[PDB]
Design a protein around this ligand. Structure first.
Ligand code: ADP
Ligand code: ADP
Ligand code: HRI
Ligand code: HRI
Ligand code: K
Ligand code: K
Ligand code: MG
Ligand code: MG
Lengths: 304, 304
């Protein structure tokens, strides 16, 4: 899938973008529907899975019922539909999580659900990126072409999610680790924030929770979480290192499983990894049992 | 292979150990000889490889020519032979490195040399551990049963090799990174130092070299190397983190190859990894291109 960076005054680029989207969305939704159709019967019969399956069918119906975009008037209305659908599907990850939680235990091939979720959630991420990019082309935000930031600062977006995770953590525990950021703190480059907006808060919540739950005697004095930024011509690496006691040997082969948690609902890690790999990067964990965990998020740079 | 921890005043345990060694060594040397016999012809014909092949045949001959140990007198003489052989074989890794350097380019299956070296060097490590353990049983060192230290301090043995690597580094560059050690600095537990004596200096030399070569403008002021110790009931983890600029993407899939170097002779990494895995652990690298590298040495704890 491609995110149009084209620009024009007659607004011709919006028409071209809209037409591309109109061509592309129905095909990709059709693929998601095929995924639901192939789910093991007993899982497909779960009422929450059925609800999500039906949402996708509705999306496909509405998208295919929309006439070919001929002019700006049409394109404007197509954007209304896209906005509606994005909103109607905003809770899909949570619905799948709930729908699958019990039902998946009823089949033996455990690879199956993992594959379905990886494929479904990453396709969905790409679909939402495409659609949101098109809508964003109508915005006049400085330093954005659609959802592409022309000068993203890793430090700034990390700090945004740090503040967010610290507030949640402070609410639950009365305090939160301080976060230090080092390495290429001054880096700025073209980049799409959206995947970071998903991934960063998941990894930060994990690191903070781990830190608090291993320092229950001294909640007022916990070890910092330390984030290192490395920017090179190939990828961006963000290392998130905590002293939260590590991931136990007995849990290590399970933490990347959808639904596994030692506590939200165990999607943070497998989802983040699937997203990173979908975009050409990776998510790798290094556990120092008894000390802490290093998490390495790598995302490939944009090809201008 | 098993390292006898048995003890006795009549010296009966030395006889039992000697007899075990006498049973075990010829079989293991025979396996190494079979490895040389199966090397690709053109490699096996290299005069340095032939020399090493012949050393192993000699070892096998001497070991099999030694009569069955009947008493302390015999056992004492068997130890002389073992000492001689250990000394005669002390440069084997270097000879294999040289012998293989050019010759390996003459075959296409590159997996072949890697497999031969992994198998040969790890078997050799185990053979030397067994033999050195037997000799050591005659020593009266406090806190040792043979080569097994009953209360090893990871911090102490790390500091030993830090001092060693810093001296080499200081000699070549006029300075050396300081090394900080954190985590479980007070840990003490039963452990066999020998593999650490190989591995630690290799990883420290790498980290220090990388650090100096990336700070050629400020040799008098370079970033510390930071070592973290994590001790748990399953394994010992030693993380060696540097700010030496990382391992480049173009080099990453090559650094674990025997002979690959960007400069000694490119054996440090593949050998250390083979040793760690041989003993039930691992050696893993995390490169932050543009910043530095984290190296994780994991070694499984001793089963008492
Ligand atoms: N930084 C960390 N330190 C220790 N444990 C962690 C860390 N990150 C993740 N984990 C473990 O992995 C499990 C799964 O994490 P995740 O998939 O994000 O789901 P959740 O946070 O909802 O449990 C967590 O329950 C926790 O046990
Ligand atoms: N900590 C490190 N930082 C940067 N590069 C490294 C590091 N460790 C190893 N390397 C790279 O890996 C290569 C192979 O290392 P090694 O197998 O120990 O052989 P050698 O040190 O003899 O080159 C080195 O030449 C170097 O390019
Ligand atoms: C555009 C829209 C159908 C989005 C879907 Cl892919 C979803 O978010 O689940
Ligand atoms: C005991 C002796 C033959 C050692 C050999 Cl395995 C070697 O160091 O190469
Ligand atoms: K999980
Ligand atoms: K190498
Ligand atoms: Mg989580
Ligand atoms: Mg080396």
């Amino acid at each position: 899938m491609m995110l149009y960076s084209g620009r024009s005054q007659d607004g011709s680029h919006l028409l071209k973008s809209g037409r591309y989207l109109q061509q592309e969305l129905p095909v990709r939704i059709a693929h998601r529907i095929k995924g639901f159709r192939s789910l093991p019967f007993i899982i497909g019969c779960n009422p929450t899975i059925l609800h999500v399956h039906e949402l996708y069918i509705r999306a496909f119906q509405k998208l295919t019922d929309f006439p070919p975009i001929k002019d700006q008037a049409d394109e404007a209305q197509y954007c209304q539909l896209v906005r509606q659908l994005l909103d109607d599907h905003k809770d899909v990850v949570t619905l799948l999580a709930e729908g699958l939680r019990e039902s998946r235990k009823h089949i033996e091939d455990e690879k199956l659900v993992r594959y379905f979720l990886d494929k479904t959630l990453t396709s969905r991420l790409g679909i939402r990126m495409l659609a949101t990019h098109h809508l964003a082309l109508h915005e006049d935000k400085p330093d954005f072409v659609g959802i592409i930031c022309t000068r993203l600062s890793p430090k700034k977006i990390i700090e945004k999610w740090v503040d967010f995770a610290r507030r949640l953590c402070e609410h639950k525990y009365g305090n939160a680790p301080r976060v230090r950021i080092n390495g290429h703190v001054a880096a700025r480059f073209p980049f799409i924030p959206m995947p970071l907006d998903y991934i960063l808060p998941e990894l930060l919540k994990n690191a903070m929770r781990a830190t608090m739950e291993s320092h229950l005697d001294t909640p007022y004095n916990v070890p910092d979480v330390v984030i290192t930024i490395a920017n090179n011509d190939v990828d961006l690496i963000i290392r998130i290192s905590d002293r939260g006691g590590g991931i136990a040997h007995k849990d290590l082969d399970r933490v990347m499983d959808y639904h596994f948690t030692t506590a939200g609902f165990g999607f943070g890690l497998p989802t983040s990894r699937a997203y990173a790999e979908y975009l050409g990067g990776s998510l790798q964990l290094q556990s120092l049992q008894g000390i802490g965990t290093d998490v390495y998020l790598r995302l490939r740079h944009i090809d201008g």
